[PDB]
């Protein structure tokens, strides 16, 4: 088991055909999960499931540049459940991050930060027990 918040270095940044796999379990009565792909202080891709935003479950995606959040992209398809184990896979493609949860496609997020080789750390936080965080090339 890993301690949350967890920082996974991505040596030399991300590259198309890099696959990041995160395994864990959502805690009971969870409020949030966040994956933050960082370029220094900037957040290239924030993936943020929210379990209770105005009594709705929603996934918020965004980018933070110079300490300012941009336009949110929201997804109402919500594959997570409190108490249950999950697998998140993030596949880096030339023009998008592609996210699958529990082997089902969820969403894609167009690259706003374009210096892919400078996105060199992934922060994982929120109301989860973290089992594994790794990457490979496909
Ligand atoms: O966009 C991701 C960040 O969202 C904010 S919450 C955010 O607040 C603005 C007002 O500034 C609007 O109400 C949005 O509807 C709302 O989603 C979080 O505080 C950050 O941690 C990011 O998750
Ligand atoms: Cl949140
Ligand atoms: Cl970084
Ligand atoms: Cl839930
Ligand atoms: Cl693409
Ligand atoms: Cl950039």
Curated annotation (Swiss-Prot):
Q: Does the keyword Cytoplasm apply?
A: yes
Q: Where in the cell is it found?
A: Cytoplasm; Nucleus; Secreted
The reply to whether ATP-binding figures as a keyword in the UniProt entry is no
Major subcellular site: cytoplasm
The protein's UniProt keywords, in alphabetical order, are:
Acetylation, Cytoplasm, Differentiation, Disulfide bond, IgE-binding protein, Immunity, Innate immunity, Lectin, mRNA processing, mRNA splicing, Nucleus, Phosphoprotein, Repeat, Secreted, Spliceosome
- GO MF entries: carbohydrate binding; chemoattractant activity; disaccharide binding; IgE binding; laminin binding; molecular condensate scaffold activity; protein phosphatase binding; protein phosphatase inhibitor activity
Listed under GO cellular component are: cell surface; collagen-containing extracellular matrix; cytoplasm; cytosol; extracellular exosome; extracellular region; extracellular space; ficolin-1-rich granule membrane
- Which GO BP terms, alphabetically? eosinophil chemotaxis; epithelial cell differentiation; innate immune response; macrophage chemotaxis; monocyte chemotaxis; mononuclear cell migration; mRNA processing; negative regulation of endocytosis
Q: Where does a beta-D-galactoside bind?
A: 69-75
What is the name attached to this protein's record?
Galectin-3
- Organism of origin is Homo sapiens (Human)
Q: What lineage, starting at the top, does this entry show?
A: Eukaryota, Metazoa, Chordata, Craniata, Vertebrata
Which residues of the parent chain are present? 113 to 250 of 250
